[PDB]
């Protein structure tokens, strides 16, 4: 996989490729690795497909139950529930997860949860096998408080590169936009992003 989440002026954007692998065979070329755990809290999934799905389903369930009893959970709270699962089951899990959400108090937030179940709050985060190839690029090109169009471009260009070099990444680039205006799904096809 290649995945990332980026905070900007109006909120946060999540992006991901659409490739699932079974060795060197592509089991699914149109996977959706960006998953909803609440109206405006989403995550990007990398690692085991089974582990990350099972985790996201449990987290969605906890937050639905949270909502019923105490109202809308903060993005920080959602990230905490992912952590608890990943940390406590670190021996049996292969899950690298980025959590991203939009509060009206807190604007956009990104928490990344690598293999051991540690938590890290960041302006943006990248992860998945393909991320190694774009540390250089992303560190050189990210700024805070980008516009929506600038942030879509940053993500498009970054994942384009990760997909180019990483054989375990590919297909389409999916994004999910998270602002006060709601929730927007974007998709970009190879013929567009490849020749950037």
């Amino acid at each position: 996989t290649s995945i990332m989440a980026v905070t900007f002026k109006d909120g946060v954007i999540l992006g991901a490729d659409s490739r699932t692998t079974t060795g060197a065979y592509i089991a699914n070329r149109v996977t959706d690795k960006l998953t909803r755990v609440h109206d405006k809290i989403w995550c990007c999934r990398s690692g085991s497909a089974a582990d990350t799905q099972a985790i996201a389903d449990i987290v969605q369930y906890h937050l639905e139950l949270y909502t019923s009893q105490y109202g809308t959970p903060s993005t920080e709270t959602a990230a905490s529930v992912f952590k608890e699962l990943c940390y406590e089951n670190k021996d049996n899990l292969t899950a690298g997860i980025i959590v991203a959400g939009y509060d009206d108090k807190n604007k956009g937030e990104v928490y990344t949860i690598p293999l051991g179940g540690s938590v890290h709050k960041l302006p943006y985060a990248i992860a998945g096998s393909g991320s190694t190839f774009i540390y250089g690029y992303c560190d050189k090109n990210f700024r805070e408080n980008m516009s929506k169009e600038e942030t879509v471009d940053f993500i498009k260009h970054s994942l384009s590169q990760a997909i180019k070099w990483d054989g375990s990444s590919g297909g389409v680039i999916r994004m999910v936009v998270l602002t006060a205006a709601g929730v927007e799904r974007l998709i970009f096809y190879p013929d567009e992003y490849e020749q950037l």
Binding site: T1, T20, T21, T31, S48
Partner: peptide, 4 residues
């Protein structure tokens, strides 16, 4: 098994 399917990885991401």
């Amino acid at each position: 098994a399917x990885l991401x």
